[PDB]
Structure 1
């Protein structure tokens, strides 16, 4: 039972999805840009991820820029409501498994919450080796 909030245009997100698969599970895939979490869900995801609201914000996207989110002038709930109204602000990928929830940045964070070991060596799409055939992280 695994869920990934996925952006196919994002290599971090692609690598994460493939590591999930390499553990032998096909996750439920949520295209968050189209189908963002509800407020309650988003609030829960953030709590489980154990990072701050601001740490989930993606920089370098149009609403972050134009809404001036770089500046320290926003409460956590203000920031939550911006994420819900402008889903590209939600950084990615977020992964939920029975073990926990993580913002998988870098992608190999997902290894922490996958219950089953990688079934063989994993190499990122740019060639960065993550685990060898024997399962050791490099």
Structure 2
């Protein structure tokens, strides 16, 4: 049972999706930019990920800049509601598996919550080796 909140325009998100597949399952794929989680789902993802609300915030995107979110003037719920109203503020990719939930940045973070081992060596799209044929992390 695997879900990934994916942005096909993000290399980290692409590498994460292919590592999931290389573990042998095809995940449910949620295009969060167009289908964001509900407030309740988002609050749960954040809890399960064990990171702060602000840590989930994507910087260098229009609403982050124009709403001034770099400044420490926002409660967590204010930030959560900005994310729901402007889903490009949600950093990516988030992956949910039976083992847990992670913001998979960098992508190989996903190896923590995949239940089955990579079926063979994995190399990121830019050529960075992640695990070898043996299964060892590089």
Query: 1:7-29, CA deviations, whole angstroms, 9 ceiling, x for partnerless residues?
Result: 00000000000000000000000
> C-alpha displacement at 1:70, in angstroms?
0.1
Q: Which runs of 4+ in 1 moved over 4 A?
A: none
Partner of 1:114: 114
Query: 1:70-117, CA deviations, whole angstroms, 9 ceiling, x for partnerless residues?
Result: 000000000000000000000000000000000000000000000000
SS of structure 2 residue aligned to 1:134: coil
Structure 2: how far apart are the matches of 1:107 and 1:6? 12
Query: Taking structure 2 as the reference length, what is the TM-score of the superposition?
Result: 1.00
Aligned residues, how many? 138
Query: Taking structure 1 as the reference length, what is the TM-score of the superposition?
Result: 1.00
> C-alpha displacement at 1:57, in angstroms?
0.2
Structure 2: how far apart are the matches of 1:23 and 1:85? 34
Structure 2: how far apart are the matches of 1:58 and 1:34? 16
> C-alpha displacement at 1:123, in angstroms?
0.1
> C-alpha displacement at 1:47, in angstroms?
0.0
Structure 2: how far apart are the matches of 1:99 and 1:12? 21
CA-based RMSD: 0.1
Structure 1: how far apart are the matches of 2:59 and 2:31? 19
Structure 1: how far apart are the matches of 2:101 and 2:5? 11
SS of structure 2 residue aligned to 1:96: strand
Structure 1: how far apart are the matches of 2:57 and 2:3? 20
SS of structure 1 residue aligned to 2:33: coil
Partner of 1:19: 19
> C-alpha displacement at 1:119, in angstroms?
0.1
